[PDB]
C-alpha cells in the first residue's frame, strides 16, 4: 500500500514551509519584554548581506513547526490488586520515579488507590506530576483558565490566534485531547472569518493547512492565497491535496490531463472543491489583473 504522507515527510515539510512563507519583520517582531540598550555595528554591503543571511537561518529555526500527532490512548493498566489494604487508606497515593536521566514518557508513575489496586497513572496525572518535579518554563501544574471556550473566543476577537497556539504548546502535550481541541478550534475560527494571514510567517501555518487538507476544506485558503497574488503557494496546496488524497477524483483528473501550475487549481475547482465557483472567479480575476496590467 502506498504510504499515507506524514507531517514530517521531507516532501510535506517542503510544501508546508513554502506556503507558510518567511518575513523577517514578522518573525522577529519586537517582544514586549524587559529591554536592554541596543548595540551598533558598522557594516559594509557584503557584511550586511551576511547578517541578513544569518537572520534568515535563525528565522528558519524559529519557524520550526510543532508536532502534529494522533490523540494518545488512555492508560488503563493494573499492576496489582492487594485487597488486604482495602479500607486502610482514605486518599490515593501517587508515586513518581524522578530519576533524572529517564525520558518523561518512559517514567513509571503509579497510583495506590484506597481499594488497594496498584495502577498506572493516567495521562492527566502523568502530565501534572511531571510539571511538579520537572517544571517547564511556560507550563502550569493546573490547566489554565484561558483555554475555556468563552475565554478563547475573547482571544479570537482580538486576533490573537498565534498566542492561543503558542500557549497551547507550552501547556499541553502535542498528543493530548486538550491540545488537539484547542488547535482545531483555532484553525476552525480562522477558516470561518478568513484570517489566514495571521498565521503566515509563523510556525503554526503548517498545522493549519495540514488540518484543512485532511478535512477536505482547503477552498478558503486557496481563495485567500489567490487574492493575495500568492498563486505559487495555492498550486503547492493543491499538490499537497493531491498527495494526501491520491484516489480522489481531483487527483485522478490531474493525472489524466497532466495539469501543472494554474491548471491544477482549475482542476480542483471542478472536481472536489466545496466552493468551486468562487475559486475560478478569484483565479479568473487574478489572471485578468495580471494580464491587463502586465
Amino acid at each position: 500500500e502506498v504510504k499515507k504522507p506524514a507531517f514530517m515527510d521531507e516532501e510535506v515539510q517542503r510544501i508546508l514551509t513554502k506556503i507558510t512563507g518567511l518575513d523577517l519583520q514578522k518573525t522577529f517582531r519586537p517582544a514586549i519584554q524587559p529591554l536592554k540598550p541596543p548595540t551598533y555595528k558598522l557594516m559594509t554591503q557584503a557584511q550586511l548581506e551576511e547578517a541578513t543571511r544569518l537572520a534568515v537561518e535563525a528565522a528558519k529555526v524559529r519557524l520550526k513547526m510543532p508536532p502534529v500527532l494522533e490523540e494518545r490512548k488512555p492508560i488503563n493498566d493494573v499492576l496489582a490488586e492487594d485487597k488486604i489494604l482495602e479500607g486502610t487508606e482514605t486518599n490515593k497515593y501517587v508515586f513518581t520515579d524522578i530519576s533524572y536521566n529517564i525520558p518523561h514518557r518512559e517514567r513509571f508513575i503509579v497510583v495506590r488507590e484506597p481499594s488497594g489496586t496498584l495502577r498506572k497513572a493516567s495521562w492527566e496525572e502523568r502530565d501534572r506530576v511531571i510539571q511538579i518535579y520537572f517544571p517547564k518554563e511556560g507550563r502550569r501544574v493546573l490547566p489554565p483558565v484561558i483555554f475555556k471556550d468563552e475565554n478563547l473566543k475573547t482571544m479570537y476577537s482580538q486576533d490573537r490566534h498565534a498566542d492561543v497556539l503558542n500557549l497551547c504548546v507550552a501547556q499541553f502535550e502535542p498528543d493530548s485531547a486538550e491540545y488537539i481541541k484547542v488547535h482545531h478550534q483555532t484553525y476552525e475560527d480562522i477558516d470561518r472569518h478568513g484570517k489566514y494571514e495571521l498565521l503566515r510567517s509563523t510556525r503554526h501555518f503548517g498545522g493549519m493547512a495540514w488540518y484543512f487538507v485532511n478535512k477536505k476544506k482547503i477552498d478558503g485558503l486557496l481563495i485567500d492565497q489567490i487574492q493575495r497574488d500568492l498563486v505559487d503557494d495555492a498550486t503547492s496546496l493543491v499538490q499537497l491535496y493531491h498527495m494526501l488524497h491520491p484516489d480522489g477524483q481531483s487527483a485522478q483528473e490531474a493525472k489524466e490531463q497532466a495539469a501543472e501550475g494554474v491548471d491544477l487549481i482549475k482542476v480542483f475547482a471542478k472536481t472536489e472543491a466545496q466552493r468551486g465557483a468562487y475559486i475560478e472567479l478569484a483565479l479568473q480575476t487574478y489572471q485578468e489583473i495580471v494580464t491587463s496590467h502586465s
Binding site: 529591554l35 536592554k36 540598550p37 541596543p38
Partner: protein, 108 residues
C-alpha cells in the same frame, strides 16, 4: 513662544559691598527654557528685584536655543562622558521605559 516652558535652576542672593548702601543685594536667577521638542536654552538674569531677574533671564535664554539630537525622540544617540571645569557628567543611552534617572536639574 507659548510652546516654550521656563524652569528655574537656581536663585541666589549675592551681595556687592558699596560705600553708599553698605551690603547691597541683587537677585541672580539661572533659568532654562525648552519646547519639549529638541530645542532648549539657558541664561542668567540679575536684578535687584526677583520678578525682574525672572523676566531678564527668561527672555535672554530664548536667544541661546541649542538644538539637541534625540535618538528616536526619546534618548541620546550614544553615551556621553565629559568634564566641564570641575563638574563631571556621565550620561548613558537607555532603552524606552527606562525613564530619567539623573540629577534633579538634569531631569528638569
Amino acid at each position: 513662544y507659548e510652546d516654550f516652558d521656563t524652569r528655574i535652576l537656581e536663585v541666589r542672593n549675592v551681595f556687592n559691598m558699596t560705600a553708599k548702601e553698605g551690603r547691597k543685594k541683587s537677585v541672580r536667577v539661572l533659568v532654562a527654557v525648552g519646547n519639549g521638542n529638541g530645542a532648549a536654552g539657558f541664561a542668567i538674569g540679575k536684578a535687584a528685584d526677583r520678578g525682574d531677574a525672572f523676566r531678564k533671564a527668561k527672555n535672554r535664554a530664548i536667544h541661546y536655543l541649542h538644538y539637541i539630537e534625540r535618538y528616536e525622540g526619546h534618548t541620546i544617540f550614544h553615551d556621553i562622558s565629559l568634564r566641564f571645569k570641575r563638574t563631571q557628567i556621565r550620561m548613558k543611552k537607555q532603552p524606552r521605559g527606562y525613564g530619567l534617572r539623573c540629577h534633579r536639574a538634569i531631569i528638569t
